[PDB]
């Protein structure tokens, strides 16, 4: 008898947009359907009962809300719960609801969140289905036997196959006869700081071939804009460019080429049909450490020397005081666990104690003669 | 007739120490040997002629020096050139000297520097032999058929197998009857900022079991010390700890357990025979991006969707204005190269344009009934 009842949780504007589009498409098939949960203004406009505002999630408060929703959705027993992105909140909640027999969907591949294999297994345990924008995301979950549906990317629905370059130039005031370069130094402060100078210097070089080159710089917010302008004042104060408040899509559609920091903004540039070069840089040390972890599952030299988890490594979300304290207590006891580790440390010390100066000296002598 | 002539380049204090030890061990076999190159104060004390000071390398100036050394070592034709660490300077120089028939050794595995396969091939082309401190470093180069000699770690020569815990406590003023915890929040500012609060909170938890726990915090320099104290004032102003200027080795030898940010300081802790827990955290986004690069060789979504280098990606040292400009010029020309990329962009756009809202709506309906 009860009409279709769908629970939804969005945690940011992008999720509110997805949720609103989902509600509209569902109402086309089930006009009497009921929607409830954590809703932004767009979802509420389509009729979603807002037990909580999406703004609240966009933390002690977040934990209490998830606890309340766990109980309330448990009583409601919705036909489906859809966690819209926000994986740090929704994956756990989906697991809580799954435990109670409720059917769950996670919308949007949680790529950043799923940083190791254990997190993949957790998504599979928490969900009945994952909705992925891109085909290689589904191919990934297929390898883990995690039900995943490739649904296409919403931005590809929103952007036409053949954008109007001259129309975008008219919006931005770019002459139609000129070559035009888009510089997108990045949405994150780290990206802007690393790459702004190099991108400006690139534009200076291009001006030597294209002295009338138009340079458009979409800047996502005031902070990043203030950051870019400060760098520019130091690096290329006399380079004339169009600083834009947002309008990245217009800038890309308008331009003849784009220089991008972000391999993810590259998608929108692709949909804009703007040829692009991706230039990105991260701290070499940070990259080396990540690569070592990906390739060996360890970060510490003792475990690499031992070929096993000799010392406890608590990384990312596990680097947390309660877990750290629990790992240290057995060692502070200065008991037999410490003596066993002590003994292994001694054997490994012997394995790399070989009078290195003398070995290097002999390598030199062997090579010289 | 000419006595053994060895060219050396060190670029930091640690390299000067290695160079001095190498010179001493060589003089034991060849007392008349001659040493020349880029030398720190320790190498000079052992007799190394300092064409340039190591301080100069510790950049236009660096480029000129490498050019001068390339010519001068080319005229000198030393029996062996040894690049001591400093790979961003020495690998290229070793390649320059190799081109002239000079025998070259690189001392110390350039793990951070060798961030991709192409850089491994470059080390092999630049060197006749690599000297590696650790066995797994040699196993790595073995896979690439790059001559590498495992020589042991110098720190393992410098530190005894059985350190004196009570002696280290006497230096630091730690009571012998007390449990003692070492907190090493990290030598880098990023590490200190991420982990100091969590490590302090861990110590607070441990105090509830060990109310007399001694807490020693080796801080590598004033900046990092000022950074830690500022964090402490906000997180645990009433937690009493021993702030140390350096003295990490003493703190580890003295302690019953150590909480470490650095998987590399973990080696020194191992040699100190101090049981340890490694707690480390890096930006999830940064880790995700690195992992994607390691696993796919790409960072941008267009190349992941295309399964090839459809768009040019210039990363790390290649993200450089001249290369960026050269990659963009063919695209700004708005010629047939741009039209070919445009056409591929259109096909990929079609492949992910599938009315996602409607697909999500149908997935919900399929699951609900």
Author numbering:
A (entry chain A), B (entry chain A): 4 to 61, 72 to 382
Copy out sentences from the published article reporting this entry, exactly as the authors wrote them.
During LPS biosynthesis, a membrane-associated glycosyltransferase (LpxB) forms a tetra-acylated disaccharide that is further acylated to form the membrane anchor moiety of LPS. LpxB is a glycosyltransferase in the Raetz (lipid A synthesis) pathway that catalyzes nucleophilic attack of the 6′-hydroxyl of lipid X (1) on the anomeric carbon of UDP-diacyl-glucosamine (UDP-DAG) (2) to form β(1–6)-tetraacyl-disaccharide 1-phosphate (lipid A disaccharide) (3). The structure reveals that LpxB has a glycosyltransferase-B family fold but with a highly intertwined, C-terminally swapped dimer comprising four domains.
In order to crystallize LpxB, a soluble form of the enzyme was generated. We identified, and mutated to Ser, six Val and Leu residues (V66, V68, L69, L72, L75, and L76) in a nearby region of the LpxB homology model. These mutations improved solubility and yield of LpxB, and the LpxB with all six mutations (LpxB6S) showed the least aggregation on a size exclusion column. In vitro activity assays suggested that the ability of LpxB6S to catalyze the reaction of Triton X-100-solubilized substrates was completely abolished. However, when the substrates were solubilized with 0.9 M 3-(1-Pyridinio)-1-propanesulfonate (NDSB 201), residual lipid A disaccharide synthesis was observable for LpxB6S by thin layer chromatography (TLC), but LpxB6S activity remained below the detection limit for UDP-release assays even with the addition of NDSB 201. These results demonstrate that LpxB6S remains catalytically competent and suggest that this solubilized form of the enzyme fails to extract lipid substrates from detergent micelles. These results suggest that the hydrophobic patch (V66, V68, L69, L72, L75, and L76) is essential for productive membrane association or substrate binding.
